[PDB]
Amino acid sequence: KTYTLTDYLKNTYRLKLYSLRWISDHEYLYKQNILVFNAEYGNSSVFLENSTFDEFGHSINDYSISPDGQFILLEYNYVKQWRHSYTASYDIYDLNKRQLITEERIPNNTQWVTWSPVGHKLAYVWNNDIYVKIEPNLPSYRITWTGKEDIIYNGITDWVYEEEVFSAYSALWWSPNGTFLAYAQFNDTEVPLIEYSFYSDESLQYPKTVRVPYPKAGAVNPTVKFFVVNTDSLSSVTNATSIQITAPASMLIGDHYLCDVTWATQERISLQWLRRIQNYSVMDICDYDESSGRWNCLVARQHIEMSTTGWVGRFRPSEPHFTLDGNSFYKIISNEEGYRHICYFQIDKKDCTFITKGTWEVIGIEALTSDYLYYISNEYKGMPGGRNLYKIQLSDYTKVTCLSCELNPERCQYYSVSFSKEAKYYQLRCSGPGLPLYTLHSSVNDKGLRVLEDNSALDKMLQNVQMPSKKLDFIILNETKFWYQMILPPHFDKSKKYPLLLDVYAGPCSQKADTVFRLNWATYLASTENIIVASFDGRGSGYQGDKIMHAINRRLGTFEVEDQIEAARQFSKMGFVDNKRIAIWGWSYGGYVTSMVLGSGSGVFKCGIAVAPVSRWEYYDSVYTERYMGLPTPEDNLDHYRNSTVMSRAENFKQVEYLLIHGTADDNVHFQQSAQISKALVDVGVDFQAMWYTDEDHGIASSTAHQHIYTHMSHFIKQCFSLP
Amino acid sequence: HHHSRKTYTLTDYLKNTYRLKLYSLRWISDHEYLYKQNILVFNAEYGNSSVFLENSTFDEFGHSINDYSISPDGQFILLEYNYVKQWRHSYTASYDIYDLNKRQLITEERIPNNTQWVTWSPVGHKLAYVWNNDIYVKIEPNLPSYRITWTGKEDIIYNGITDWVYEEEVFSAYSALWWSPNGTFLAYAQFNDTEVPLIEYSFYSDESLQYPKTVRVPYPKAGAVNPTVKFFVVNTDSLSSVTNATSIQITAPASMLIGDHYLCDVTWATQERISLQWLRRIQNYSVMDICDYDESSGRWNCLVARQHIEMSTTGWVGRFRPSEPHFTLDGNSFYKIISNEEGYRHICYFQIDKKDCTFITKGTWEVIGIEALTSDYLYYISNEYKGMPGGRNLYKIQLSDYTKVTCLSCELNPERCQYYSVSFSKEAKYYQLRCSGPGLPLYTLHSSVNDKGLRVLEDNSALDKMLQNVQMPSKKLDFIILNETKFWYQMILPPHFDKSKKYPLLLDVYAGPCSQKADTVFRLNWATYLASTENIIVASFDGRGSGYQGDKIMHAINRRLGTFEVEDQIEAARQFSKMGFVDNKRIAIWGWSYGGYVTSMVLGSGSGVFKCGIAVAPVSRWEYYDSVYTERYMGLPTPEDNLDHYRNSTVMSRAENFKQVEYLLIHGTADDNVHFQQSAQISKALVDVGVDFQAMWYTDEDHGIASSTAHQHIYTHMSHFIKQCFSLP
């Protein structure tokens, strides 16, 4: 038998995870029941039983143990908002007594909650204001009084900061020992609202209009203010006093963003700010002052990170990792040859020294100790789509050890890591070419303690199914390596001609050719329909240096689009591809590129599917769009904004079969974007197929809609490929 | 060859290869009408037409002239430009006035931009116009206008113009202004939408609009808060530029003010007598008031003795609304189509001071409309000829002798003409007949004194020439017996139709209350193409709920929408397949609006009769459609009325059954009538039960999906879907 659409949609074959949350430097929690595990022995006692909260009445979505292990926070009444944001009810459970607190409870509709990093202090956001609980059963102190729905956000992000800047709803930062609470304040007063209908359940007589403050390209952005409150000197008599830290003079001169918050020590915080033109950012290092109670960020302690060839950072400037004394830090920046490497900074000195070098990139700094910096990179075998954990000796930068490279080179070439509280242990997460493998390691000697999850259950289930394989490789274009992957049908025959589906994203810093094992739609297409599904990382793609990544700076809808067409041409020349049956599909940026490709009039592609595509860049949000496109003004980049629309390519869609799909409640890529594509196609008399999804957002992630869209897409591709 | 090789193609339909010529005229007097070659004044009797306005006269105008309107006295012309469509009847335009005698544009005190309605008095050249929701009157075109109302408020208070629901469902017009016969009085309605909830939807506009617009329209859905209505009459002769105008309120009868009600008809009877019809929100009870002007009061008074009640125990009253009265010259009598004791609609003769009327027509057929009445004759359209409800003829009944009824149009050309409408001159001395009948449309002129044909105005001979060579389809108009009742169907049959072959069939459905889809009208439409080119039979059926056949058939679906009319369409297809020439592996159904709903209900019925179908802008559940139309047939969506059937006749509840059929669902996103909502709820329900189907939204299109480009796209799209459903290459 084969891996079917049903298998994909119903998860017949499930990849087991081994999700753990470190509680200390040698203990971690795991759900089977919730057990505590020992890293030394692997023994486990039950921490809270299957039904410890039986007579609760509510359904528990998640939990959060306080750092000192004295209280547990139960989260229920989960209502998803955007990508990361949501609302929930909360209860505090005294662990020393095993009983829910009933006094001064956390209110319903709480936007964000968090423990302080030590002890059991609590900070939550409710109705856009910040409250603090020193003790779970004591009244909370109100920190901010300016909270206003859709307008002022204290300690939580607005739509655009949530999606594009912090990848989080929270804008609350505890100092390491919980003394200070730092937060951001966002003002959306003059930011225009995107409006769309929400139809809701059949019983709703009149559709509801959703209105979300959302800055599209070149519109009025939110403004940001930054505060730090002392949670140890809180009065129950007077209103708490918040100390503002103003953005540096180089940022105040125009529109800007707060793009990073990172505490260095107990009395030192680092903030990164980004100009609206995102090629200039500044890091301030701010110290708490004694006989003034204020925060001072010495002009001399400013660190500038700018780019001559593009934007700054992969998606934002990278975060700093301070040494314990906070007089030094490490961060990933692109070197003089454009490759992202770790640079070592002195709090006071302008120049940093690079501690990594080469024609590969550091992905992330993972942990810092007294003697070692740990990082993940794609250095192993010059493969940008592999991921390995390396150890770098701080006293000698040349002494670099790959901790994961050789553990299982056959099945594992893509690792992530999770260190214990003080990096004494680490769990390795291999998502590698073979089935995922989760292993525990002692960092003192780098030996492997034990296998946590090996997916042998999946492994034997899969023994009985004709499974596809992955070919990961590169082609040469202009004396440059460009990587691609193919999901090849089972019993693949080089001498026979297969239909090929080109799976595209191709956004700036994207990577679609990697060593990750996946069970997805492509898996079914290859396994059952005998379709090759290819992906390709061309210009604009990430983790290969700025020469490649910055190629599309200010030129979205050009090189990354052309390169996808070129990749398909190269794939025809591999001899096992039926060039009468090449297709392309993508979601979001992938939707855009698919559409741009189908409208290019290249003649390479028979058909395509665009899901929730951007159709023109003025329709998309400011932070993301302007990062690559600049501003849509006559003095900046209007001409290319005007040039890079799918609408302008409508005529060329006469040569191809198109499917356009979009959820009507997409807060991210607004239905508007597809509504304009469809209108333009109609206006030039192009026939095509469409599908809207009522009330689905950008994820089209309802169990039923998810199943419906993939089913619908399968029929379209099978129809396009003459597959019965 | 030399035999017909051509067919009527999809391109022919979309590009208008074969154009039907019309002959639209407008009577100016009792013996002259206007026409357009250039604007001429044809003399009806001789044919001599002197030139009235050359095409060039407005070349220097600087704007494209959408329409024109000559004052009743031919002294002034109204030029309409900057036309901006709103709903089905409503729009906005600029207006200028050209003095026909003085030969130039009036520049002083011009009608403002964004005028909602303009109209001449029926005699002379008084003017009434609505702007910013208020009424203004110009006694002369170049003088300052008199402001009648001061209460107009966008979306809240409408003066002399209807709100959404009154435009669409009650008056079929934007104006709520009615001049008295000689222009002395200007009657108007005033609607109040303060608590009517707003439908809201996105308008995407030109691609240069960065943020979509949200359109907000006061629109009462079934059971919602309705607009209130007040009625006024102002004397335009006693206007002054020193005091504000005095509007005299005419209140509704107490039997109406007791609960929610509507004004459904306004009809002047004389210079000093107006008749109002009012309808209760439960639309089974209506009251006509008849109101004389009082000379000493300066007020209007409706005498309770002259009050007339029209009701129905079986359904609603009127075909879509209570019928309009047609008054005798003295205004002491009127004629009015009402349903007789056995449910057939006929002309009843009423006396102003009397309760009981006398029926002037009888029979198992119906009067469609009263068209004209004189001292000696009443002229009306009916479907009596050959007992064919889908046929239409002009009849003449003698007022002094009801047994003397003459058919004026029946026998003119019986073979090509079986469906007529009429246009009478100002005092019925001449009339134009429009034959749309089985053959090519024919326009003729007549004098009513001797009823002889004066001339052929337009005979569509150019089109007859072009068609002489193309394999056109034929129409079969016949009936079937069901529960010993005749139900009529039509078939657009492919050329060289062969009884022995098995053709695929498309059920073209509408099936709304008082609908008629089986008639004698000649049409060049999508159905023409399907038959001519694709060899598909496209049939239509008038089952229970349909009109022009009596209340027995028409009221069968009262309070029961989505039942018998739906069931009868399914039943029809069974009959068609059992006629022997239908391939019942290939039966499709398609409809728009109510027809979209019926399509959806049929596809979701689980009958197994249909392979596929297309629903365009369908209603999906009655709580989503407007109060006036829905409640007419469905009552209130309340537990103590009809909530049960409201909840029971949604297409959503039938989602599961769509697993058995190929479905295409189409809807314009800016549909102000049947909201996109209705399809959005259908789609969600089909997604929820894992049914695959096909969809197409039309960005910024409304209920008509009428844009040149969109119109062509949807028909191309549907053609592909139907061709693939039927395995047609």
Ligand SMILES: *[C@@H]1O[C@H](CO)[C@@H](O[C@@H]2O[C@H](CO)[C@@H](O)[C@H](O)[C@H]2NC(C)=O)[C@H](O)[C@H]1NC(C)=O
């Ligand atoms: C959020 O920003 C808005 C817009 O800048 C601020 O509103 C202005 O406040 C000033 C002084 O209070 C007034 O004089 C202006 O007229 C306001 N403009 C508008 C558009 O409202 C608002 O004060 C800010 N709120 C916070 C809490 O910072």
Ligand SMILES: *[C@@H]1O[C@H](CO)[C@@H](O[C@@H]2O[C@H](CO)[C@@H](O)[C@H](O)[C@H]2NC(C)=O)[C@H](O)[C@H]1NC(C)=O
């Ligand atoms: C802390 O600050 C808040 C908001 O600034 C105060 O609450 C307001 O108090 C003023 C008078 O001082 C009233 O006019 C407002 O109506 C109050 N707003 C609300 C509902 O909070 C609060 O009293 C302050 N606490 C003190 C006394 O320091």
Ligand SMILES: *[C@@H]1O[C@H](CO)[C@@H](O[C@@H]2O[C@H](CO)[C@@H](O)[C@H](O)[C@H]2NC(C)=O)[C@H](O)[C@H]1NC(C)=O
């Ligand atoms: C339109 O109708 C509304 C009611 O729907 C009228 O508003 C009322 O006005 C009176 C007196 O001004 C108030 O007592 C009521 O509270 C209002 N009604 C409600 C409930 O809103 C309004 O006057 C009408 N408009 C006009 C000018 O006719």
Ligand SMILES: *[C@@H]1O[C@H](CO)[C@@H](O)[C@H](O)[C@H]1NC(C)=O
């Ligand atoms: C693991 O085992 C030791 C005894 O060998 C015990 O003291 C410790 O508490 C255990 N930890 C857990 C997680 O139960």
Ligand SMILES: *[C@@H]1O[C@H](CO)[C@@H](O)[C@H](O)[C@H]1NC(C)=O
């Ligand atoms: C949260 O909401 C529910 C439902 O209204 C209510 O019964 C409960 O008391 C609320 N809990 C809190 C913490 O306010």
Ligand SMILES: *[C@@H]1O[C@H](CO)[C@@H](O)[C@H](O)[C@H]1NC(C)=O
């Ligand atoms: C936390 O840091 C603050 C500020 O430096 C300091 O006063 C305090 O000692 C620390 N708390 C403890 C007891 O760890």
Ligand SMILES: *[C@@H]1O[C@H](CO)[C@@H](O)[C@H](O)[C@H]1NC(C)=O
């Ligand atoms: C940042 O971008 C602007 C606009 O593209 C450009 O003119 C400027 O040179 C850039 N600044 C830096 C510091 O590279």
Ligand SMILES: *[C@@H]1O[C@H](CO)[C@@H](O)[C@H](O)[C@H]1NC(C)=O
């Ligand atoms: C129409 O014809 C009549 C009769 O022959 C003629 O006298 C007249 O000039 C024409 N009509 C007008 C008023 O132009």
Ligand SMILES: *[C@@H]1O[C@H](CO)[C@@H](O)[C@H](O)[C@H]1NC(C)=O
């Ligand atoms: C209508 O608008 C145009 C353009 O704004 C203006 O020139 C013209 O005078 C206006 N017409 C009237 C009669 O107000």
Ligand SMILES: *[C@@H]1O[C@H](CO)[C@@H](O)[C@H](O)[C@H]1NC(C)=O
């Ligand atoms: C007419 O009515 C309005 C308000 O209803 C008033 O403002 C206006 O001045 C009145 N006209 C005069 C001057 O009589």
Ligand SMILES: *[C@@H]1O[C@H](CO)[C@@H](O)[C@H](O)[C@H]1NC(C)=O
């Ligand atoms: C129009 O009607 C009014 C009301 O009956 C009357 O006073 C007036 O004389 C009429 N006008 C003419 C010129 O017939």
Ligand SMILES: NCc1ccccc1-c1ccccc1
């Ligand atoms: N908004 C940045 C982002 C982050 C994660 C995934 C997708 C996207 C995205 C959506 C739409 C268009 C371009 C990117």
Ligand SMILES: NCc1ccccc1-c1ccccc1
């Ligand atoms: N609103 C009555 C009407 C009149 C003319 C044409 C269609 C319709 C209509 C639209 C939607 C649903 C039911 C009827």
